[PDB]
Design an enzyme around this catalytic site. Structure first.
Site, PDB file in Angstrom:
ATOM      1  N   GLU C 256       0.730  -1.053   0.249  1.00 49.01           N
ATOM      2  CA  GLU C 256       0.028  -0.308   0.286  1.00 49.01           C
ATOM      3  C   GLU C 256       0.974   1.378  -0.120  1.00 49.01           C
ATOM      4  O   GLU C 256       2.269   1.418   1.127  1.00 49.01           O
ATOM      5  CB  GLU C 256      -0.871   0.017   1.458  1.00 49.01           C
ATOM      6  N   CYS C 290      -1.866   9.503   2.641  1.00 49.71           N
ATOM      7  CA  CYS C 290      -2.084   8.021   1.164  1.00 49.71           C
ATOM      8  C   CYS C 290      -2.128   9.037   0.515  1.00 49.71           C
ATOM      9  O   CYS C 290      -2.430   8.795  -0.526  1.00 49.71           O
ATOM     10  CB  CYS C 290      -1.940   6.681   1.699  1.00 49.71           C
ATOM     11  N   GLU C 387       4.340  13.601  -4.604  1.00 50.76           N
ATOM     12  CA  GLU C 387       3.679  13.408  -3.436  1.00 50.76           C
ATOM     13  C   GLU C 387       4.731  14.394  -2.846  1.00 50.76           C
ATOM     14  O   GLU C 387       5.112  14.164  -2.719  1.00 50.76           O
ATOM     15  CB  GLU C 387       3.542  12.212  -3.415  1.00 50.76           C
TER      16      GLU C 387
HETATM   17  N1  LIG Z   1       2.019   5.427   1.927  1.00 47.13           N
HETATM   18  C1  LIG Z   1       1.820   6.140   3.139  1.00 47.13           C
HETATM   19  O1  LIG Z   1       0.723   5.560   3.464  1.00 47.13           O
HETATM   20  C2  LIG Z   1       3.136   6.959   3.290  1.00 47.13           C
HETATM   21  C3  LIG Z   1       3.199   6.785   4.471  1.00 47.13           C
HETATM   22  C4  LIG Z   1       4.250   7.390   4.894  1.00 47.13           C
HETATM   23  C5  LIG Z   1       5.295   8.329   4.033  1.00 47.13           C
HETATM   24  N2  LIG Z   1       4.887   7.904   2.463  1.00 47.13           N
HETATM   25  C6  LIG Z   1       5.926   8.680   1.401  1.00 47.13           C
HETATM   26  O2  LIG Z   1       7.539   8.298   1.910  1.00 47.13           O
HETATM   27  C7  LIG Z   1       8.291   9.760   2.017  1.00 47.13           C
HETATM   28  C8  LIG Z   1       8.951   9.017   3.640  1.00 47.13           C
HETATM   29  O3  LIG Z   1       8.246   8.305   4.652  1.00 47.13           O
HETATM   30  P1  LIG Z   1       9.117   7.246   4.638  1.00 47.13           P
HETATM   31  O4  LIG Z   1      10.427   7.110   4.350  1.00 47.13           O
HETATM   32  O5  LIG Z   1       9.145   7.320   6.381  1.00 47.13           O
HETATM   33  O6  LIG Z   1       8.413   6.070   4.044  1.00 47.13           O
HETATM   34  P2  LIG Z   1       9.388   5.171   3.776  1.00 47.13           P
HETATM   35  O7  LIG Z   1       8.706   4.301   2.862  1.00 47.13           O
HETATM   36  O8  LIG Z   1      10.901   5.234   3.624  1.00 47.13           O
HETATM   37  O9  LIG Z   1       8.924   3.830   5.195  1.00 47.13           O
HETATM   38  C9  LIG Z   1       8.304   2.792   5.481  1.00 47.13           C
HETATM   39  C10 LIG Z   1       8.165   1.972   6.435  1.00 47.13           C
HETATM   40  O10 LIG Z   1       9.105   1.291   6.004  1.00 47.13           O
HETATM   41  C11 LIG Z   1      10.721   0.605   6.173  1.00 47.13           C
HETATM   42  N3  LIG Z   1      11.732   1.342   5.339  1.00 47.13           N
HETATM   43  C12 LIG Z   1      12.549   2.215   5.296  1.00 47.13           C
HETATM   44  N4  LIG Z   1      13.462   2.349   4.446  1.00 47.13           N
HETATM   45  C13 LIG Z   1      13.974   0.287   3.956  1.00 47.13           C
HETATM   46  C14 LIG Z   1      13.732  -0.569   3.340  1.00 47.13           C
HETATM   47  N5  LIG Z   1      14.833   0.079   2.679  1.00 47.13           N
HETATM   48  N6  LIG Z   1      13.824  -1.947   3.570  1.00 47.13           N
HETATM   49  C15 LIG Z   1      12.810  -2.205   4.318  1.00 47.13           C
HETATM   50  N7  LIG Z   1      12.248  -1.465   4.568  1.00 47.13           N
HETATM   51  C16 LIG Z   1      12.150  -0.526   5.230  1.00 47.13           C
HETATM   52  C17 LIG Z   1      10.642   1.848   7.350  1.00 47.13           C
HETATM   53  O11 LIG Z   1      11.489   2.537   8.664  1.00 47.13           O
HETATM   54  C18 LIG Z   1       8.996   2.693   7.713  1.00 47.13           C
HETATM   55  O12 LIG Z   1       8.950   1.993   8.904  1.00 47.13           O
HETATM   56  C19 LIG Z   1       7.321  10.930   2.539  1.00 47.13           C
HETATM   57  O13 LIG Z   1       7.243  11.652   1.730  1.00 47.13           O
HETATM   58  C20 LIG Z   1       5.664  10.393   1.252  1.00 47.13           C
HETATM   59  O14 LIG Z   1       5.420  10.968   0.571  1.00 47.13           O
HETATM   60  C21 LIG Z   1       3.642   7.878   2.095  1.00 47.13           C
END
Ligand SMILES: NC(=O)c1ccc[n+]([C@@H]2O[C@H](COP(=O)([O-])OP(=O)(O)OC[C@H]3O[C@@H](n4cnc5c(N)ncnc54)[C@H](O)[C@@H]3O)[C@@H](O)[C@H]2O)c1
Ligand SMILES: [Mg+2]
Ligand SMILES: [Mg+2]
Ligand SMILES: [Mg+2]
Ligand SMILES: [Mg+2]
Ligand code: NA
Ligand code: NA
Ligand code: NA
Ligand code: NA
Lengths: 493, 493, 488, 493
Positions: C256, C290, C387
């Site tokens: 998602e 999201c 986004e």
């Molecule tokens: N889809 C959503 O609801 C949602 C939520 C938060 C952020 N975002 C988007 O992401 C951008 C940055 O947010 P972010 O860096 O916290 O999101 P992210 O995708 O980096 O993190 C999401 C989760 O996955 C984990 N994760 C991060 N890198 C990973 C890797 N290499 N392997 C496995 N797991 C990993 C993180 O620790 C976190 O718990 C924001 O600008 C936003 O646009 C989207």
């Protein structure tokens, strides 16, 4: 549309049991009439109690455990249905013509509508044959539980005359798809088309005894079916009056399962923001379709006061232009009524409307010297308490009423013992969603009418019937559920 | 099991309408008795036609479009069912004691079995309230078609005396989960526990009129419900005989929908490769459970000839050791029968068993000088033509028959107008499968008996009833299907 | 009084452990920039421990495998009751760690968590397999078994809710879980772990490893003994998850991810209603949603009118301390998000979009950003394609219904969409034409535990919520047995 | 079974895009070989990246909203699938001959098995086209909520060489039934039969661009599909190794949806109470079927110690009697392996088994001096640690293992990274139920093997794949779910 044979030869007119043709045990016959002329088409074997008993016995033997029909792969049941459809489509031109000859409806409609819907119904259920799954169930304790969807068994099927071939297909489709066997009683007014299909059922390759057809009258052959001690289930389409008799007979005998498709007095609701041209024409079709002989006819046309007068004007003009005549004439929109009895009931209902205070706007009389043709009739300023407003007329007789509010119209529409169908014409999302929710009807059409699909269930609320035909839902009444619960060494998720 | 009050006070003994307690309009009352002592517990308001009319009136009002109950979130109906279960669990000790007082069954069984199943049933359906979806349907043409699964409406529910609380729960569960309203007529022999539950229904938060309970007699209050012009659906659990009356009354009035849970004469089949000890103990439980007063009791015990003698001997020994006595004694396995009428009826069938040449092996008489206790009774060498082999005794009277082949036993087990349940005891995979398929019964147990799960449907073939309760299937009878078909600009997949 | 933190370690086998490395990371209050407390920093080795405990709890014949399905449902309900019991506390802690207004945490987030868990409590014993009328003398049926050890990785924007959306379906269907919560918001999920223990779930059924993404998260995605991964977060990382799955043991995957959802206002819409809902559609949860309606398409005949009201409303939006009941909008979650939003606002001004209000920092302490509205946004602009995840509204002008369909669908995202109109035909045509997992009509951000949610295209794969939510947590087994004589 | 032309003419050998035949952009062609003679049948156009781009563009165009394929009634998609089946059956004899020429399998098998299974698959999914409903959902608040089951879009489908026609049907069936469009990459070893079917797809009436077929190699045409930015979904059947490459390609590209059907090392478990004659013959079939080239081959035959020696002797006897030779000869049970690569791979594993200490009981070498024929080979006393006991051989090489207890055999059977299928032979109900529950396999057969039904889903646990094909489950991966939530004036139940 292909040129019809306006004088189709009749090949089948006897009782159909075990894929063989038989005379009635009493050797009696009865005539069936061409309603466009009043002249006899042919004689037909008159089935009665003893003929039904034979049919039921043939069905029971065909349904016995270990028999060819009980052992046949479900997928193969599907193929047989598909094969039956192909045979029908082969004889489409003949069957449409014969349908018209015996019923009265325009040949072009028999061909493009009735026959089309027969094929779609059978081909739809062909696909269900091997897909109506039972369940595996996560019951408490160290057990494994599951359900089998088994056939209910010997099914009595009694059908009316307004859509002979179509009513037969709505019956056979689900029953055969789910492996049941059938004893069918066709209407005395229109037995011919269904008997010919019986021959196609044979040619298709259905084992003998799986489908049996007993032509004959109601209080005799019909009653004998509904009260039979060895009939597991009955499905009845017809009048509400006889529906009660069927239900009483079921309880009085062997507690056979019952579903009922009865009459109606369906409200067609035209809101003030509706497209006028569309609504006028569709309101016309909603009532006058099939000589008004339709269970779900829009026989209560509620029109919002702002557009009432304009709507009536155009509805009268359209009615006055409706072509009545010979059903084999490509220009005819309306054939005769089915028989004399109907012909006179209708005329009677028109007389009540005149005396009761309704305003006759056009038609209202007999339209020809021969056959049972009635003039397209429209009544203005109808009131909820009038006879033509509360009782099913089953003729080309239109009731145009007048309303002011949505809350008014919902109450008046629902103030009926009937609940088969309803429709709403409006461009407004909210009004559409609110009305279709509020209306007590098995089918609610929005900005359209008489749209039937083999995929979508059809049936009545209240006294318009119980249960549903078409769709997945139509399989339910032909299924008996068995639960099997087995002790296991150790239950795991 | 916690120590019960063997003299539980009665708080509710009137008619329950609109969450309020009322006397009968006529002010008449009737006594309910302790079957263990034959003494009167208290008087109960005797509801009749007029009281039914008030209940229906309140149920119709509560079901009106736009009412708290019609607008309530489906999920919140689930919560209300869950709250009811919690309240019942809070008063479990009291209710189990009162159930034993009025019905006669062992207090330990009332607590650990009955109450447990009531809780499991209500909690199960609490989860269904927001999950019984309708369908969106890929119909032909430029149309969007879907179905709503609306409530059927005013539901009359008529229940028996053998599992008072449980029968109430099997009815309320699916009905309230799907947003219906109820007029429930409880058994005159056991009205008390259900009336106290009504108090919990009110305390739980259910809107007034959603559940109404009328204690009273069958031909009076019961018949008034079955024939009522404003009841949409009736669910009946009881004798086959009264089931005919319900079905007739339906068709004779307003074509209300009908489901029936009736009696049976269920075959319990023991193959020669069965675990002897397990099969003997389960066959005992299958017959004698709940004083033998169970719709699906295994009252035809078929045993394969190679193990017949040993099976009989062990079955007799176990019946002789079955403890009969005071229901509040933790050692009692079998309390009294429910009342005088049932008492005499069982004794009557035991007489017929002697008269017809069935081999009486133990018991056969009255088991106490006070109350309605009957000695555990076992007949051997029973034949299919005997009365005790054909008719439902509903008492602690066991029938043991002998057979040789699988072919033979299938035919004899199926040679009955009943078909509620059946069982098969064997270690063989193929035998288990062939039998579970061949048997005409709504439930087929393998290597077990009387295994009921809220998740698994239950109901009869043939004259044992129609429709199913429990599981997802239990929702079907309480749902009216509405098709909505809307004209769209351009249909796409 | 601020809520005291009780749980800040790694949760495995219903016990609290420090990281194998003894390392800790701080978590911060975004309203003040101050450290709340230290949290155990889980990594590969801590993940290995959690997975082992999960595998053990899932072994055939274990208490969790043998437990009645109906009882799994009761456990879910009991967990809900405990959360409701501690509703005030969890709401407050959620605000402290995340930044969102306390009133919203309490009435919205916590409410949605309870509804999710109670909904799935009812599914536990109702997700039937099938019995099947196969050809030949055979009996065929399917079992819906649990997929097994489920790795679940979740974001920071709705910490409790995302936890619930994951645990609900997984537990209802008898799976075991190794959850990796966001480093920005680990606290509330860890307290729920304590409640899971109180409710009576067997040890090993749920394990929670706080930590970072490339460490703990990647270790879960690449783990040789994890059967299924469910990831919610950025599209960029969703790709990493997928690759890891393929590169390791072919564990099943659902995603998602992000979006750029179009909110479409037709000329016959209810103007007042449309303005308020369009405002909520974009600004809800500091714009950190999201499915935010971050492309507001407005029909030209009502453009100016809509814009004027939209700007007036944006200027009245109250930004500040999330514990103050006046506050509509708290701070962004952290400095990185804070800076990133400011960057996007700059590209909007530079690329020629019309700044109508806001655009700047709203406080000298914390990560507060003014409610910002751009007008005359073009499809090619950065703020229209990427986004932002902040309180930054884009308003685009269109003329025809065919136009808005083509422009809305011209995206690599497809998570959500909405249509505002009174016309039956327009509503039906649009809801059909739009390539989005959720189409709202005359409303926005209406979430139902009963109704599935997820993205088309690169906004994700698979669905959460509703019955569909159980599908990815089920492994199907067909059993086909020869019988003496098949009958219908 | 009609006598085939052993040298059937090839009519189609180009790329199929928009119902047209195209040379590759490069004009390159590759030869395809008759595995029975080692001789070239004919050259075929070699699709590559640019040919894939054109196919994808054509698929995208055909899938555009408002296109003939998107607007086509679901029911009509069903009719088209049935028409395709009829054309395949019409040309059954030819397709069976060509299949054998290109693949090597016995003609009698191609005709009676493969072709039959193709017809059943297509005819099954024809029935699903208009029956895979979405749901109407009782969401909280004043809203109406429902889901649409829309097609996932452009579907890349990549298939292997072991069941060329069958694999094509398993893919096209559910994809087309649900209204998707296809770009299919057929195996380079066996492109001929799938290309002829393309001609029938065109003849059937499917709109141009709905099904596109690109013959060519894996790392070129196949990878081009897996990495394409405009392919929405990919379904892959083949080796686990490439399965990982597909999944990686999806994540690295546009996050297309992925389902995989891979290899296995399925355990066939023979309990001591099994029927020896039936178990031996089925165990033989389970392994040697289709030259051993079957994903779910029972290549780990566990036999209980009490019957091991006898089971082995009879297995070896049956193996030595297996007829190997010309596939068109009616007595032939085993044709050649598909190609030279598989030929050498099997000789490698045989050599591996010998050097690992496995007991060679028969065969073990080349069976002919022309083509790729391998002697039926049986290894005895195989241990879990052996390579031939862990890795997929995909040849006529049987492994027989010994076990003692049921608890032991479960652990040994589940101790694998594969989990495609498994079987149990026993007469005991409990053993069957315990094992069927305990085994980690997508399909568990009881007293049978390789029983495939269009109605029953097939797919692997663990690294044997993800998702399922066949049955209703096969529609899931080809459906994209959309929720529509609409605000209403007032929600009612
Ligand atoms: N889809 C959503 O609801 C949602 C939520 C938060 C952020 N975002 C988007 O992401 C951008 C940055 O947010 P972010 O860096 O916290 O999101 P992210 O995708 O980096 O993190 C999401 C989760 O996955 C984990 N994760 C991060 N890198 C990973 C890797 N290499 N392997 C496995 N797991 C990993 C993180 O620790 C976190 O718990 C924001 O600008 C936003 O646009 C989207
Ligand atoms: Mg009559
Ligand atoms: Mg009586
Ligand atoms: Mg990051
Ligand atoms: Mg390769
Ligand atoms: Na006639
Ligand atoms: Na009593
Ligand atoms: Na934080
Ligand atoms: Na070849």
């Amino acid at each position: 549309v292909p040129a019809p044979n306006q004088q189709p030869e009749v090949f089948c007119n006897q009782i159909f049991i075990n894929n063989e043709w038989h005379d009635a045990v009493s050797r009696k016959t009865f005539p069936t009439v061409n309603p466009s002329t009043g002249e006899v088409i042919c004689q037909v074997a008159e089935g009665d109690k003893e003929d039904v008993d034979k049919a039921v016995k043939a069905a029971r033997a065909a349904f016995q455990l270990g028999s060819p029909w009980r052992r046949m792969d479900a997928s193969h049941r599907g193929r047989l249905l598909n094969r039956l459809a192909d045979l029908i489509e082969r004889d489409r031109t003949y069957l449409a013509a014969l349908e018209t000859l015996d019923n009265g409806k325009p040949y072009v409609i028999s061909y493009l509508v009735d026959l089309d819907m027969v094929l779609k119904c059978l081909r739809y259920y062909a696909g269900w044959a091997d897909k109506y799954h039972g369940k595996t169930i996560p019951i408490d304790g160290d057990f494994f539980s599951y359900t089998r969807h088994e056939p209910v068994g010997v099914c009595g099927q009694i059908i009316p005359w307004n859509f002979p071939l179509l009513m037969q297909a709505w019956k056979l489709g689900p029953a055969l798809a789910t492996g049941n066997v059938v004893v069918m009683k066709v209407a005395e007014q229109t037995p011919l088309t269904a008997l010919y299909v019986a021959n196609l059922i044979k040619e298709a390759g259905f084992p003998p005894g799986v489908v049996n057809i007993v032509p004959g009258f109601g209080p005799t052959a019909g009653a004998a079916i509904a009260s039979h001690e060895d009939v597991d289930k009955v499905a009845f389409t017809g009048s509400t009056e006889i529906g009660r008799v069927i239900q009483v007979a079921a309880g009085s005998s062997n507690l056979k399962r019952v579903t009922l498709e009865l009459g109606g007095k369906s409200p067609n609701i035209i809101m003030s923001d509706a497209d006028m041209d569309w609504a006028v024409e569709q309101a016309h079709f909603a009532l006058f379709f099939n000589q008004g002989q339709c269970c779900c006819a829009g026989s209560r046309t509620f029109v919002q006061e702002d557009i009432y007068d304009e709507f009536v004007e155009r509805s009268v003009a359209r009615a006055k232009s409706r072509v009545v005549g010979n059903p084999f004439d490509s220009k005819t929109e309306q054939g005769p009524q089915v028989d004399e009895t109907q012909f006179k009931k209708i005329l009677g209902y028109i007389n009540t409307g005149k005396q009761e205070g309704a305003k006759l706007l056009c038609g209202g009389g007999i339209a020809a010297d021969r056959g049972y043709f009635i003039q397209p009739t429209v009544f203005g300023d109808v009131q909820d308490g009038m006879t033509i407003a509360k009782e099913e007329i089953f003729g080309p007789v239109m009731q145009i009423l007048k309303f002011k509010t949505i809350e008014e119209v919902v109450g008046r529409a629902n103030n009926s013992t009937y609940g088969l169908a309803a429709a709403v014409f409006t461009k407004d999302l909210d009004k559409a969603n609110y009305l279709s929710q509020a209306l007590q009807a098995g089918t609610v059409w929005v900005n359209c009418y008489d749209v039937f699909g083999a995929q979508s269930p059809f049936g009545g609320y209240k006294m318009s019937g119980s249960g549903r035909e078409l769709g997945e839902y139509g399989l339910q009444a032909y299924t008996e559920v068995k639960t099997v619960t087995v002790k296991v060494p150790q239950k795991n998720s």
